[PDB]
Amino acid sequence: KSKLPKPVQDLIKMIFDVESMKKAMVEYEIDLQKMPLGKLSKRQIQAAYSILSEVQQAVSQGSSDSQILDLSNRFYTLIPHDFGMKKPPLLNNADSVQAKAEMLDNLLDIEVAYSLLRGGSDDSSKDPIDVNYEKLKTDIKVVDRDSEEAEIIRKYVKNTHATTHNAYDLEVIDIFKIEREGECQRYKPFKQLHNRRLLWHGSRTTNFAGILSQGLRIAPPEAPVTGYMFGKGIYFADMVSKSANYCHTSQGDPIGLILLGEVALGNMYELKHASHISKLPKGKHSVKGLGKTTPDPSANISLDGVDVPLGTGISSGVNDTSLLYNEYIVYDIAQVNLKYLLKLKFNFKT
Numbered sequence: 001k002s003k004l005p006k007p008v009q010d011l012i013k014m015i016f017d018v019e020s021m022k023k024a025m026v027e028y029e030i031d032l033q034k035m036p037l038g039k040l041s042k043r044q045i046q047a048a049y050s051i052l053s054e055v056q057q058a059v060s061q062g063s064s065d066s067q068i069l070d071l072s073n074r075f076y077t078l079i080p081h082d083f084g085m086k087k088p089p090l091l092n093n094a095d096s097v098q099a100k101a102e103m104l105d106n107l108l109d110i111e112v113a114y115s116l117l118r119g120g121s122d123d124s125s126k127d128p129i130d131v132n133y134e135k136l137k138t139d140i141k142v143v144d145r146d147s148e149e150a151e152i153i154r155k156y157v158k159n160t161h162a163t164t165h166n167a168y169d170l171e172v173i174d175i176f177k178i179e180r181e182g183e184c185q186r187y188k189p190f191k192q193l194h195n196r197r198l199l200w201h202g203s204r205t206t207n208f209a210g211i212l213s214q215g216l217r218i219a220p221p222e223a224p225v226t227g228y229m230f231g232k233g234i235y236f237a238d239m240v241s242k243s244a245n246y247c248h249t250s251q252g253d254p255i256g257l258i259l260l261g262e263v264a265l266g267n268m269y270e271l272k273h274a275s276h277i278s279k280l281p282k283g284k285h286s287v288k289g290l291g292k293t294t295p296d297p298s299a300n301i302s303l304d305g306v307d308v309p310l311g312t313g314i315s316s317g318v319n320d321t322s323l324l325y326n327e328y329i330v331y332d333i334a335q336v337n338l339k340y341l342l343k344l345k346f347n348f349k350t
Protein backbone atom coordinates (compact mmCIF):
# COMPACT_ATOMS: atom_id res chain seq x y z
CA LYS A 1 0.00 0.00 0.00
CA SER A 2 0.98 3.62 -0.74
CA LYS A 3 3.77 5.21 1.31
CA LEU A 4 2.57 8.73 0.53
CA PRO A 5 0.97 10.99 3.17
CA LYS A 6 -2.84 10.91 3.13
CA PRO A 7 -3.26 14.56 1.98
CA VAL A 8 -1.03 13.67 -0.97
CA GLN A 9 -3.05 10.57 -1.91
CA ASP A 10 -6.21 12.68 -1.53
CA LEU A 11 -4.77 15.28 -3.90
CA ILE A 12 -3.98 12.61 -6.49
CA LYS A 13 -7.57 11.36 -6.50
CA MET A 14 -8.84 14.93 -6.74
CA ILE A 15 -6.86 15.67 -9.89
CA PHE A 16 -7.54 12.33 -11.59
CA ASP A 17 -11.31 12.44 -10.90
CA VAL A 18 -13.13 11.19 -14.02
CA GLU A 19 -16.51 12.34 -12.77
CA SER A 20 -15.13 15.88 -12.46
CA MET A 21 -14.04 15.65 -16.11
CA LYS A 22 -17.58 14.71 -17.19
CA LYS A 23 -19.23 17.33 -15.02
CA ALA A 24 -16.90 19.99 -16.44
CA MET A 25 -17.99 18.97 -19.96
CA VAL A 26 -21.73 18.54 -19.46
CA GLU A 27 -21.47 21.90 -17.74
CA TYR A 28 -20.27 23.17 -21.09
CA GLU A 29 -23.32 21.47 -22.63
CA ILE A 30 -21.09 18.98 -24.46
CA ASP A 31 -22.99 15.93 -25.73
CA LEU A 32 -21.46 13.06 -23.76
CA GLN A 33 -23.10 10.35 -25.87
CA LYS A 34 -21.52 11.40 -29.16
CA MET A 35 -18.41 12.94 -27.62
CA PRO A 36 -17.32 10.87 -24.60
CA LEU A 37 -14.04 11.43 -22.82
CA GLY A 38 -12.50 8.49 -24.71
CA LYS A 39 -13.21 10.16 -28.06
CA LEU A 40 -11.35 13.33 -27.04
CA SER A 41 -8.38 14.06 -29.32
CA LYS A 42 -6.02 17.05 -29.43
CA ARG A 43 -6.03 17.04 -33.23
CA GLN A 44 -9.78 17.68 -33.06
CA ILE A 45 -9.28 20.50 -30.51
CA GLN A 46 -6.61 22.14 -32.68
CA ALA A 47 -9.05 22.12 -35.60
CA ALA A 48 -11.65 23.80 -33.41
CA TYR A 49 -9.11 26.46 -32.35
CA SER A 50 -8.57 27.10 -36.06
CA ILE A 51 -12.29 27.38 -36.86
CA LEU A 52 -12.69 29.73 -33.88
CA SER A 53 -9.85 31.89 -35.18
CA GLU A 54 -11.62 31.77 -38.57
CA VAL A 55 -14.81 33.11 -36.95
CA GLN A 56 -12.99 36.01 -35.26
CA GLN A 57 -11.46 37.02 -38.59
CA ALA A 58 -14.93 36.92 -40.20
CA VAL A 59 -16.43 38.80 -37.24
CA SER A 60 -13.73 41.49 -37.34
CA GLN A 61 -14.01 41.57 -41.11
CA GLY A 62 -17.82 41.83 -40.92
CA SER A 63 -18.74 38.98 -43.25
CA SER A 64 -22.18 38.78 -44.90
CA ASP A 65 -24.17 36.35 -42.72
CA SER A 66 -24.05 32.93 -44.44
CA GLN A 67 -20.30 32.87 -43.87
CA ILE A 68 -20.65 33.24 -40.09
CA LEU A 69 -23.51 30.72 -39.90
CA ASP A 70 -21.46 28.16 -41.85
CA LEU A 71 -18.27 28.63 -39.79
CA SER A 72 -20.50 28.35 -36.72
CA ASN A 73 -22.04 25.13 -38.00
CA ARG A 74 -18.57 23.78 -38.74
CA PHE A 75 -17.49 24.35 -35.13
CA TYR A 76 -20.59 22.77 -33.61
CA THR A 77 -20.11 19.76 -35.91
CA LEU A 78 -16.55 19.20 -34.71
CA ILE A 79 -17.40 19.86 -31.07
CA PRO A 80 -20.76 18.09 -30.41
CA HIS A 81 -23.01 20.07 -28.07
CA ASP A 82 -26.52 19.40 -26.79
CA PHE A 83 -28.89 22.37 -26.61
CA GLY A 84 -32.14 20.48 -27.34
CA MET A 85 -34.76 21.89 -29.73
CA LYS A 86 -32.65 25.03 -30.01
CA LYS A 87 -29.81 25.68 -32.43
CA PRO A 88 -26.48 26.38 -30.70
CA PRO A 89 -25.53 30.00 -30.18
CA LEU A 90 -24.33 31.82 -33.27
CA LEU A 91 -20.66 32.72 -32.86
CA ASN A 92 -20.96 36.20 -34.39
CA ASN A 93 -19.13 38.37 -31.84
CA ALA A 94 -15.98 38.56 -29.66
CA ASP A 95 -17.67 37.55 -26.44
CA SER A 96 -19.08 34.43 -28.10
CA VAL A 97 -15.83 32.98 -29.55
CA GLN A 98 -13.79 33.85 -26.47
CA ALA A 99 -16.18 31.81 -24.34
CA LYS A 100 -15.82 28.92 -26.77
CA ALA A 101 -12.05 29.37 -26.94
CA GLU A 102 -11.69 29.22 -23.17
CA MET A 103 -13.88 26.11 -23.28
CA LEU A 104 -11.50 24.35 -25.71
CA ASP A 105 -8.56 25.18 -23.41
CA ASN A 106 -10.00 23.27 -20.40
CA LEU A 107 -11.37 20.59 -22.73
CA LEU A 108 -7.75 20.13 -23.81
CA ASP A 109 -6.45 19.91 -20.23
CA ILE A 110 -9.14 17.26 -19.63
CA GLU A 111 -7.96 15.35 -22.74
CA VAL A 112 -4.35 15.58 -21.58
CA ALA A 113 -5.54 14.49 -18.14
CA TYR A 114 -7.54 11.49 -19.42
CA SER A 115 -4.61 10.50 -21.63
CA LEU A 116 -2.34 10.28 -18.60
CA LEU A 117 -4.92 8.35 -16.58
CA ARG A 118 -5.98 5.84 -19.25
CA GLY A 119 -2.29 5.25 -19.99
CA GLY A 120 0.62 3.39 -18.43
CA SER A 121 0.93 -0.13 -17.00
CA ASP A 122 -2.10 -2.23 -16.09
CA ASP A 123 -0.50 -4.42 -13.42
CA SER A 124 -2.09 -4.87 -9.99
CA SER A 125 1.13 -4.98 -7.95
CA LYS A 126 1.25 -1.26 -7.10
CA ASP A 127 -1.71 0.66 -5.70
CA PRO A 128 -3.28 3.04 -8.30
CA ILE A 129 -2.55 6.17 -6.26
CA ASP A 130 1.16 5.32 -6.34
CA VAL A 131 0.83 4.66 -10.04
CA ASN A 132 -1.14 7.88 -10.65
CA TYR A 133 1.37 9.83 -8.57
CA GLU A 134 4.29 8.57 -10.65
CA LYS A 135 2.45 9.83 -13.73
CA LEU A 136 2.75 13.43 -12.53
CA LYS A 137 6.57 13.55 -12.65
CA THR A 138 6.45 15.88 -9.65
CA ASP A 139 7.81 15.39 -6.15
CA ILE A 140 5.02 16.35 -3.73
CA LYS A 141 5.46 16.80 -0.01
CA VAL A 142 3.18 18.17 2.70
CA VAL A 143 4.04 21.55 4.21
CA ASP A 144 3.57 21.38 8.00
CA ARG A 145 0.89 23.70 9.41
CA ASP A 146 3.15 25.18 12.12
CA SER A 147 5.88 25.87 9.59
CA GLU A 148 7.18 29.35 8.83
CA GLU A 149 6.48 28.57 5.18
CA ALA A 150 2.86 27.69 5.87
CA GLU A 151 2.53 30.88 7.90
CA ILE A 152 3.92 32.91 5.02
CA ILE A 153 1.51 31.31 2.53
CA ARG A 154 -1.45 31.74 4.87
CA LYS A 155 -0.70 35.46 5.37
CA TYR A 156 -0.30 35.92 1.64
CA VAL A 157 -3.71 34.29 1.09
CA LYS A 158 -5.46 36.16 3.88
CA ASN A 159 -3.88 39.55 3.24
CA THR A 160 -4.43 39.62 -0.53
CA HIS A 161 -8.05 38.57 0.03
CA ALA A 162 -10.49 41.30 1.13
CA THR A 163 -14.16 42.33 1.55
CA THR A 164 -14.99 44.02 -1.79
CA HIS A 165 -15.05 40.69 -3.63
CA ASN A 166 -15.80 38.88 -0.41
CA ALA A 167 -18.72 36.84 -1.67
CA TYR A 168 -16.71 34.09 0.04
CA ASP A 169 -13.91 33.40 2.55
CA LEU A 170 -10.81 31.24 1.95
CA GLU A 171 -9.51 28.47 4.18
CA VAL A 172 -6.28 26.60 3.52
CA ILE A 173 -6.77 22.88 4.06
CA ASP A 174 -3.41 21.71 2.71
CA ILE A 175 -0.23 23.28 1.38
CA PHE A 176 2.10 21.19 -0.80
CA LYS A 177 5.71 21.89 -1.79
CA ILE A 178 6.21 20.98 -5.45
CA GLU A 179 9.21 20.15 -7.62
CA ARG A 180 8.42 18.91 -11.10
CA GLU A 181 10.98 16.50 -12.51
CA GLY A 182 13.69 18.57 -14.23
CA GLU A 183 12.01 21.92 -13.58
CA CYS A 184 15.27 23.17 -12.06
CA GLN A 185 18.02 23.21 -14.68
CA ARG A 186 15.50 24.82 -17.02
CA TYR A 187 14.65 27.66 -14.62
CA LYS A 188 18.12 28.03 -13.06
CA PRO A 189 19.64 29.93 -16.00
CA PHE A 190 16.75 32.35 -15.51
CA LYS A 191 17.52 32.20 -11.78
CA GLN A 192 20.33 34.61 -12.64
CA LEU A 193 17.53 37.02 -13.47
CA HIS A 194 16.56 39.67 -10.92
CA ASN A 195 12.98 40.61 -10.14
CA ARG A 196 12.08 37.09 -9.02
CA ARG A 197 8.61 36.96 -7.48
CA LEU A 198 6.35 34.43 -5.76
CA LEU A 199 3.04 34.66 -7.56
CA TRP A 200 -0.35 33.03 -7.74
CA HIS A 201 -1.77 30.88 -10.54
CA GLY A 202 -5.32 29.63 -10.19
CA SER A 203 -6.86 27.06 -12.54
CA ARG A 204 -9.73 24.54 -12.50
CA THR A 205 -9.17 21.28 -10.65
CA THR A 206 -9.42 19.23 -13.88
CA ASN A 207 -6.38 21.00 -15.32
CA PHE A 208 -3.79 20.04 -12.67
CA ALA A 209 -3.00 16.57 -13.99
CA GLY A 210 -1.74 18.42 -17.09
CA ILE A 211 -0.04 21.42 -15.45
CA LEU A 212 1.92 19.13 -13.13
CA SER A 213 2.89 16.60 -15.80
CA GLN A 214 3.91 19.23 -18.37
CA GLY A 215 4.08 22.47 -16.37
CA LEU A 216 2.26 25.64 -17.38
CA ARG A 217 2.23 25.90 -21.18
CA ILE A 218 1.48 28.63 -23.72
CA ALA A 219 -1.37 28.61 -26.22
CA PRO A 220 -0.52 27.49 -29.78
CA PRO A 221 -0.56 29.97 -32.68
CA GLU A 222 -3.78 28.48 -34.11
CA ALA A 223 -5.69 29.45 -30.94
CA PRO A 224 -7.85 32.58 -31.24
CA VAL A 225 -6.19 35.80 -30.10
CA THR A 226 -9.42 37.27 -28.68
CA GLY A 227 -9.86 37.51 -24.90
CA TYR A 228 -6.16 37.81 -24.06
CA MET A 229 -5.18 40.99 -22.26
CA PHE A 230 -1.49 40.83 -23.15
CA GLY A 231 -1.05 38.07 -25.77
CA LYS A 232 -0.52 34.31 -25.42
CA GLY A 233 1.62 33.63 -22.35
CA ILE A 234 1.55 32.46 -18.74
CA TYR A 235 -0.55 34.74 -16.54
CA PHE A 236 0.16 35.35 -12.85
CA ALA A 237 -1.38 37.47 -10.08
CA ASP A 238 0.17 38.97 -6.93
CA MET A 239 -3.22 38.85 -5.19
CA VAL A 240 -5.02 35.60 -4.37
CA SER A 241 -8.40 37.26 -5.07
CA LYS A 242 -7.68 37.67 -8.79
CA SER A 243 -6.38 34.08 -9.15
CA ALA A 244 -9.09 32.45 -7.03
CA ASN A 245 -11.54 33.41 -9.78
CA TYR A 246 -10.06 30.76 -12.09
CA CYS A 247 -10.57 27.82 -9.72
CA HIS A 248 -14.25 27.89 -10.66
CA THR A 249 -15.57 26.59 -7.34
CA SER A 250 -19.17 26.72 -6.11
CA GLN A 251 -21.46 25.71 -3.26
CA GLY A 252 -21.54 22.21 -4.78
CA ASP A 253 -17.79 21.92 -5.25
CA PRO A 254 -16.26 24.44 -2.74
CA ILE A 255 -12.73 23.08 -3.00
CA GLY A 256 -10.12 24.28 -5.49
CA LEU A 257 -6.36 24.27 -6.15
CA ILE A 258 -4.08 27.26 -6.49
CA LEU A 259 -0.41 27.42 -7.54
CA LEU A 260 2.40 29.56 -6.14
CA GLY A 261 5.25 29.80 -8.62
CA GLU A 262 8.53 31.64 -8.69
CA VAL A 263 8.67 33.77 -11.80
CA ALA A 264 11.87 35.33 -13.15
CA LEU A 265 10.19 38.50 -14.40
CA GLY A 266 13.24 40.70 -15.11
CA ASN A 267 12.60 44.27 -16.25
CA MET A 268 8.86 44.45 -16.77
CA TYR A 269 7.03 46.22 -19.56
CA GLU A 270 4.32 48.10 -17.74
CA LEU A 271 0.95 48.48 -19.41
CA LYS A 272 -2.50 49.77 -18.43
CA HIS A 273 -4.63 48.43 -21.29
CA ALA A 274 -4.95 45.35 -23.46
CA SER A 275 -2.08 45.34 -25.89
CA HIS A 276 -0.97 43.12 -28.73
CA ILE A 277 2.56 42.39 -27.60
CA SER A 278 4.01 38.93 -26.93
CA LYS A 279 7.12 40.47 -28.54
CA LEU A 280 8.91 42.41 -25.81
CA PRO A 281 10.72 45.71 -26.19
CA LYS A 282 14.51 45.22 -26.07
CA GLY A 283 15.67 44.80 -22.47
CA LYS A 284 12.31 43.74 -21.02
CA HIS A 285 11.45 40.17 -20.11
CA SER A 286 7.90 40.34 -18.86
CA VAL A 287 4.71 42.37 -18.88
CA LYS A 288 3.05 43.85 -15.81
CA GLY A 289 -0.60 44.82 -16.23
CA LEU A 290 -1.24 47.65 -13.78
CA GLY A 291 -4.34 47.08 -11.67
CA LYS A 292 -6.27 49.57 -9.55
CA THR A 293 -5.40 47.54 -6.45
CA THR A 294 -2.06 46.15 -5.35
CA PRO A 295 -0.71 44.74 -2.11
CA ASP A 296 0.73 47.40 0.19
CA PRO A 297 4.34 47.60 -1.06
CA SER A 298 5.65 48.37 2.43
CA ALA A 299 4.88 44.81 3.53
CA ASN A 300 6.94 42.96 0.91
CA ILE A 301 9.29 40.13 1.95
CA SER A 302 11.93 38.57 -0.34
CA LEU A 303 12.87 34.94 0.32
CA ASP A 304 16.18 33.51 -0.92
CA GLY A 305 15.96 36.59 -3.16
CA VAL A 306 12.38 35.67 -4.07
CA ASP A 307 9.97 38.54 -3.56
CA VAL A 308 6.75 37.80 -1.69
CA PRO A 309 4.20 40.67 -1.85
CA LEU A 310 1.78 39.53 0.86
CA GLY A 311 0.79 43.08 1.81
CA THR A 312 -2.85 43.87 2.45
CA GLY A 313 -4.56 45.27 -0.67
CA ILE A 314 -4.46 49.02 -1.17
CA SER A 315 -5.44 51.44 -3.90
CA SER A 316 -2.49 51.52 -6.33
CA GLY A 317 -1.01 54.51 -8.08
CA VAL A 318 -3.41 54.54 -11.06
CA ASN A 319 -7.04 53.46 -11.54
CA ASP A 320 -7.20 54.77 -15.11
CA THR A 321 -6.43 51.15 -15.91
CA SER A 322 -8.66 48.41 -17.27
CA LEU A 323 -7.64 45.89 -14.59
CA LEU A 324 -8.72 45.67 -10.95
CA TYR A 325 -5.60 43.78 -9.84
CA ASN A 326 -2.03 43.33 -11.05
CA GLU A 327 -1.23 40.81 -13.77
CA TYR A 328 2.25 39.44 -14.60
CA ILE A 329 2.92 37.71 -17.92
CA VAL A 330 5.81 35.66 -19.20
CA TYR A 331 6.22 34.34 -22.73
CA ASP A 332 8.92 31.81 -21.99
CA ILE A 333 8.04 28.60 -20.14
CA ALA A 334 11.44 28.28 -18.41
CA GLN A 335 10.76 31.54 -16.60
CA VAL A 336 8.41 29.71 -14.21
CA ASN A 337 9.28 27.42 -11.29
CA LEU A 338 6.17 26.06 -9.57
CA LYS A 339 6.94 25.88 -5.84
CA TYR A 340 3.67 25.34 -4.01
CA LEU A 341 0.23 23.88 -4.57
CA LEU A 342 -2.60 24.89 -2.28
CA LYS A 343 -5.82 23.06 -1.62
CA LEU A 344 -8.44 25.59 -0.52
CA LYS A 345 -12.02 25.48 0.63
CA PHE A 346 -14.28 28.39 -0.33
CA ASN A 347 -16.98 29.35 2.19
CA PHE A 348 -19.63 31.22 0.20
CA LYS A 349 -21.37 34.24 1.77
CA THR A 350 -24.28 33.80 -0.64
Ligand SMILES: O=c1[nH]c2cc(CN3CCCC3)ccc2n2cccc12
Nearest residue numbers: 105106200201202235236237243246
Ligand atom coordinates in the same frame (compact mmCIF):
# COMPACT_ATOMS: atom_id res chain seq x y z
O1 LIG B 1 -4.07 32.68 -11.82
C1 LIG B 1 -4.60 32.80 -12.91
N1 LIG B 1 -5.19 31.74 -13.58
C2 LIG B 1 -5.84 31.88 -14.81
C3 LIG B 1 -6.46 30.79 -15.38
C4 LIG B 1 -7.10 30.94 -16.59
C5 LIG B 1 -7.80 29.78 -17.20
N2 LIG B 1 -6.91 28.75 -17.76
C6 LIG B 1 -6.27 29.17 -19.03
C7 LIG B 1 -6.10 27.87 -19.78
C8 LIG B 1 -6.92 26.80 -19.08
C9 LIG B 1 -7.63 27.48 -17.94
C10 LIG B 1 -7.13 32.16 -17.23
C11 LIG B 1 -6.52 33.25 -16.66
C12 LIG B 1 -5.89 33.09 -15.45
N3 LIG B 1 -5.27 34.16 -14.83
C13 LIG B 1 -5.20 35.45 -15.28
C14 LIG B 1 -4.49 36.17 -14.34
C15 LIG B 1 -4.16 35.27 -13.29
C16 LIG B 1 -4.66 34.03 -13.62
